[PDB]
């Protein structure tokens, strides 16, 4: 952090192989001004820029196809030296992403403008809202904390949970006042003598309209030109 963020370093701007879900759920709502890079499931092959617009982010679709002539893998490039490479983006192609990542720095893509990597940023939860909640957990690791938003709490800490955001974390509020997002396979389940009644978890039960995971898209993922 603080001076790991670039277009020409390939490890804070870029996410790698980073979930559809899971490229726009930490950009999305980072700052004024963020994007990334995923590798589309779907399109293993071909890479794709997110750009925090707006709710959500903008998912885009790239294509390498690689300095391959039509046919040959490469008769003709060492020669000259000067060998261009293969990467476009919506419409616009150049060499790689960071070269085009720069071009729609303020240019406007497709309605967004380009900006800064997310990169890790930091944590924020990212749970939800208007739902029952009760207290029954007991910490049983010695974190520290990632912001004084976050739940850290030591070894043997009673926290209440808010919510299930996760399974890796639990949203929860420490025995002093304060509250945030603790870490799940670092607490458990305890009753000390307030079990309460409720779940909400189990609201469901994953029926056929709602299914795990989540509603596939083996598609595109659009193109920052359309019709501009």
């Given at each position: 952090?603080?001076?790991?963020?670039?277009?020409?370093?390939?490890?804070?701007?870029?996410?790698?192989?980073?979930?559809?879900?899971?490229?726009?759920?930490?950009?999305?709502?980072?700052?004024?001004?963020?994007?990334?890079?995923?590798?589309?499931?779907?399109?293993?092959?071909?890479?794709?820029?997110?750009?925090?617009?707006?709710?959500?982010?903008?998912?885009?679709?790239?294509?390498?196809?690689?300095?391959?002539?039509?046919?040959?893998?490469?008769?003709?490039?060492?020669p000259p030296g000067v060998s261009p490479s293969r990467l476009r983006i919506g419409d616009?192609?150049?060499?790689?992403?960071?070269?085009?990542?720069?071009?729609?720095?303020?240019?406007?893509?497709?309605?967004?403008?380009?900006?800064?990597?997310?990169?890790?940023?930091?944590?924020?939860?990212?749970?939800?809202?208007?739902?029952?909640?009760?207290?029954?957990?007991?910490?049983?690791?010695?974190?520290?904390?990632?912001?004084?938003?976050?739940?850290?709490?030591?070894?043997?800490?009673?926290?209440?949970?808010?919510?299930?955001?996760?399974?890796?974390?639990?949203?929860?509020?420490?025995?002093?006042?304060?509250?945030?997002?603790?870490?799940?396979?670092?607490?458990?389940?305890?009753?000390?003598?307030?079990?309460?009644?409720?779940?909400?978890?189990?609201?469901?039960?994953?029926?056929?309209?709602?299914?795990?995971?989540?509603?596939?898209?083996?598609?595109?993922?659009?193109?920052?030109?359309?019709?501009?």
């Amino acid at each position: 952090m603080a001076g790991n963020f670039d277009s020409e370093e390939r490890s804070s701007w870029y996410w790698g192989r980073l979930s559809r879900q899971e490229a726009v759920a930490l950009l999305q709502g980072q700052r004024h001004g963020v994007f990334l890079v995923r590798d589309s499931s779907t399109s293993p092959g071909d890479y794709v820029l997110s750009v925090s617009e707006n709710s959500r982010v903008s998912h885009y679709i790239i294509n390498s196809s690689g300095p391959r002539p039509p046919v040959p893998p490469s008769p003709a490039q060492p020669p000259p030296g000067v060998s261009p490479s293969r990467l476009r983006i919506g419409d616009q192609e150049f060499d790689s992403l960071p070269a085009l990542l720069e071009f729609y720095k303020i240019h406007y893509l497709d309605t967004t403008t380009l900006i800064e990597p997310v990169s890790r940023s930091r944590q924020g939860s990212g749970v939800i809202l208007r739902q029952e909640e009760a207290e029954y957990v007991r910490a049983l690791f010695d974190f520290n904390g990632n912001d004084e938003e976050d739940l850290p709490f030591k070894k043997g800490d009673i926290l209440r949970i808010r919510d299930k955001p996760e399974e890796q974390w639990w949203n929860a509020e420490d025995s002093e006042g304060k509250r945030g997002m603790i870490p799940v396979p670092y607490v458990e389940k305890y009753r000390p003598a307030s079990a309460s009644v409720s779940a909400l978890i189990g609201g469901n039960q994953e029926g056929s309209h709602p299914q795990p995971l989540g509603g596939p898209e083996p598609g595109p993922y659009a193109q920052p030109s359309v019709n501009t």
